[PDB]
Each structure stands twice: as C-alpha cells, then as structure tokens.
C-alpha cells in the first residue's frame, strides 16, 4: 500500500480552458536523494512528514469540494466574482425644459429652473470558465498521493497527466 | 396643447400614425399574409416612418468637425514628426475611424 | 523624385448628440466589463527566411 511519504505533485498553469495542465512530482526539493548519516532518518524525513502534513491542512481549508482534480469548467458561483458595483451619473442638461428656450430664440454656448437628474447603473452577468490566477493557488494546493498507483485503474489520478482530457477519458496529444 | 392640435390630421393619413399591420382590419392582414406569394397587397398601404425627436438632439450645438494645429517639432532627415495634444470642450465622444 | 510636406494636419468628425445621451455612454464605457476590444484582420507573427 504505502510506498514512502512521497513528494507532493505541483500543478502547472495554462491560459485556461479550465485545465491545470496536469501535475508532476516536485524535483526542486531534496528528501529522497543520498549522502548524510543514518541519524538523519528522523531529522530529514520528519521534515518531509511536516511538509506533507501542512499540505493536507492547507488544501482542506482553502479548496472547494470537487469530484475531480480539474473540473474543466468551474460554475458561475465558484469562479469568484470580481466584477464592479453600481455607480451614479449626474445628467448635465434639461432637454425638455431648456429647448423651448432655443425655440424662443435663445442661443446657448444652470440659469433656468433647478431640475437635475441622477441616473443609476449596474454591471455584467456571471461568467463560467477557467479559474482566476489568484484563485488558482487556493484551488490547487499540491496533492500528496500516499499509496501510489495502488488499486484498480479508475481511481488512479489521470489528471496529473498533461495530455489527458477527462470529458472524453482519452489521452491524445497528436504525437 | 400643440400635440392634439396638430397630429390627428397626419395620422388620418399615415405619415405619423401606426404601421399598416396595426390599422388594417385583422382579417385583411391575415389575407394579405396568406396570399402574399401570388397577389401582393404589401404596396397598397403606407407605413409611417418617424425619426426620434429626443436624446440625439445636438442641444447647445457645437462643431461637427475639428482641425488640429501647427506649431514646431524636432527635425529629422527622412521622417516628418508630428504631434497633437487635441482639443477639448464638453460632452462628446470621438470615433477614431473618422479621423484622418 | 522628391516629396515635400507642408501642412500635416489632423481632422476629426464628431457625432452630435445630446449631452445626457453622451454622458450616459461615458459612464457605461468607464466600467471594465464594458472594455472595448479589437483584433487584427490578419493576426499573425510574420517571419521572413532567406
């Protein structure tokens, strides 16, 4: 079952169809090479234990529940809305009580009655698509797979493959 | 006052009324649709066509065209360097397809 | 052959419109969800090889 306490899987980035461009083992870290002493077995793999533990906690707090590593499209509720709020325009003119003045021979280039109009306005409809880059970090905390490739295929992460498509369940790269 | 005084004259005719699909009896509109492909009626009746009267009016009324000006530059042998700082006034929106 | 320029002058044409119609439009297109976007007809990286 358990084969080590393994290095996390770092997800890549992409210009977003809703994929995270697969993931791959972290190889910008030690903790699985050689040369030190045998008294560092609980001084260097206690480190690696600690890193993984911080990851499980970190992922659980900051990540929405999902049935898939890469959903390929987040719902409109779960993209995180950063769209603007309402605003007000003070309209500069009467055009229904300072136009009978120009018909009355007045040329123009606030002296008539104190009618001033305020107009409200809103902002866009919800969008569904790939996740933002600020919210990529919180949705893709590195994953620790603790029993690598154990059990039947069909519970293996195939979403760590940067060629896989989960809405056709095939890997096609045209190579 | 002015509006009921002059306007029933014009919608007696059909230069200010409603379109023919609305002033013809519904049986005649139904027949004209049914028979359209071999015995047109869509010619014997005028539709009014009335320009919007408000919220597009010039109002104060200011220029339709501008030209922007001569002063000095930094000299170059094979290129001609031109700068503008544009004119500004009040409440218009420029389209850059209409600049040359 | 030689070419001179005397007068390089800039022209602009404005659609006359109400200053309430105009000012409504400005507020609409000062939102970043109403950002204008444009793209080249031939959008290409152009590379010449001998």
């Amino acid at each position: 079952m358990s084969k080590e306490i393994p290095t996390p899987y770092m997800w890549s980035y992409q210009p977003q169809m809703g994929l995270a461009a697969g993931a791959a083992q972290d190889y910008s870290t030690r903790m699985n090479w050689l040369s030190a002493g045998p008294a560092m077995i609980s001084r260097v793999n206690d480190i690696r234990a600690h890193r993984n533990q911080i990851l499980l906690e970190q992922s659980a707090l900051t990540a929405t529940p999902r049935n898939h590593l890469n959903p390929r499209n987040w719902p409109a509720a779960l993209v995180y809305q950063e769209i603007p709020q309402p605003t007000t325009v003070l309209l500069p003119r009467d055009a229904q009580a300072e136009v009978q003045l120009t018909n009355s021979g007045v040329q123009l280039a606030f002296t008539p009655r104190q009618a001033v109009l305020t107009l409200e306005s809103s902002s866009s409809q919800p969008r569904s698509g790939g996740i933002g880059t600020l919210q990529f970090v919180e949705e893709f905390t590195p994953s620790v797979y603790f029993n690598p490739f154990s059990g039947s295929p069909g519970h293996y992460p195939d979403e760590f493959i940067p060629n896989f498509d989960a809405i056709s369940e095939s890997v096609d790269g045209y190579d | 006052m002015a509006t009921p005084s002059m306007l029933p004259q014009w919608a007696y005719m059909h230069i200010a009324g409603q379109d023919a699909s609305e002033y013809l009896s519904p049986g005649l509109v139904q027949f004209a649709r049914a028979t359209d492909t071999y015995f047109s009626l869509g010619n014997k009746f005028r539709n009014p066509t009335v320009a919007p009267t408000h919220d597009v009016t010039t109002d104060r009324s200011q220029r339709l065209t501008l030209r922007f000006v001569p002063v000095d530059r930094e000299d170059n042998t094979y290129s001609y360097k031109v700068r503008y700082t544009l004119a500004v006034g009040d409440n218009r929106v420029l389209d850059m397809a209409s600049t040359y | 052959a030689s070419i001179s320029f005397t007068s390089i002058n800039l022209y602009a044409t404005f659609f006359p419109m109400a200053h309430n119609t105009a000012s409504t439009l400005e507020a609409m297109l000062r939102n970043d969800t109403n950002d204008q976007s444009f793209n080249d007809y031939l959008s290409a990286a152009n590379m010449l090889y001998p």
Partner: peptide, 21 residues
C-alpha cells in the same frame, strides 16, 4: 438587399430613467 431607404428605430435613445435630485 434591394433597399434604398433607412429604417427609423421608432424609439429614442435610453429606455432607462433616473430620478430628479
């Protein structure tokens, strides 16, 4: 198309209205 005559829209600019202040 075979048209030589514009439409009018038959409605002015902006449906949406603001309160007097």
């Amino acid at each position: 198309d075979i048209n030589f005559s514009s439409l009018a829209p038959r409605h002015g600019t902006r449906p949406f209205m603001g309160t007097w202040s």
